């Protein structure tokens, strides 16, 4: 993945994303067109 | 987890999860801290 | 795959890969499309 | 190992494993540290 890739799409590093609640991770991925 | 908490954590029912390949079940459990 | 091509594809030596749990080896082989 | 545990560890059934050359059976057992 890499932070810069995560920052570019989600506005936060992978570390931060990974700490979000699971249902927020699977919201953000829907919003960003990823699945 | 109870069935309801399983849905709340995994985002699918225990029955949906159990139809996934074992390798993917034991990814999804590890992804969280439930294995 | 040759040792050098294995490292290019999986990002790690065959030795390291073999230390992974089978579920993760059989995730990675899926993620890359290998048997 | 039980039959199901053997599949979980080696990635194949006991009867499939039996159709590997003995040198490879005796590779796999060592790769898994099962001795």
UniProtKB/Swiss-Prot annotation, chains A, B, C, D:
Region (Absolutely required for activity) residue spans: 29-32
Record PTM text: Phosphorylated on tyrosine residues. The unphosphorylated form increases the initial rate of actin-nucleating activity, whereas the tyrosine-phosphorylated form inhibits actin-nucleating activity, enhances actin-bundling activity and enhances actin-severing activity by reducing high Ca(2+) requirements. The tyrosine-phosphorylated form does not regulate actin-capping activity.
Location relative to the cell: Cytoplasm, Cytoskeleton; Cell projection, Microvillus; Cell projection, Lamellipodium; Cell projection, Ruffle
Effect caused by changing residue 23 to A: Loss of F-actin binding
Annotated tissue distribution: Specifically expressed in epithelial cells. Component of brush border microvilli.
Free-text comment about domains: Consists of a large core fragment in the N-terminal portion and a small headpiece (HP) in the C-terminal portion. The core fragment is necessary for both actin-nucleating and -severing activities, whereas the HP binds F-actin strongly in both the presence and absence of calcium and is necessary in actin-bundling activity. The Gelsolin-like 1 repeat is necessary for the actin-capping activity. The entire core fragment is necessary for the actin-severing activity.
Entry's family note: Belongs to the villin/gelsolin family.
Subunit architecture: Monomer. Homodimer. Associates with F-actin; the association with F-actin is inhibited by tropomyosin.
Protein function: Epithelial cell-specific Ca(2+)-regulated actin-modifying protein that modulates the reorganization of microvillar actin filaments. Plays a role in the actin nucleation, actin filament bundle assembly, actin filament capping and severing. Binds phosphatidylinositol 4,5-bisphosphate (PIP2) and lysophosphatidic acid (LPA); binds LPA with higher affinity than PIP2. Binding to LPA increases its phosphorylation by SRC and inhibits all actin-modifying activities. Binding to PIP2 inhibits actin-capping and -severing activities but enhances actin-bundling activity.
Protein name, entry field: Villin-1
The encoding gene: VIL1
Part of the intact protein present: 792 to 826 of 826
């Amino acid at each position: 993945l890499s932070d810069e890739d995560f920052k570019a799409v989600f506005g936060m590093t992978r570390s931060a994303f990974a700490n979000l609640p699971l249902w927020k991770q699977x919201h953000l991925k829907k919003e960003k067109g990823l699945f």
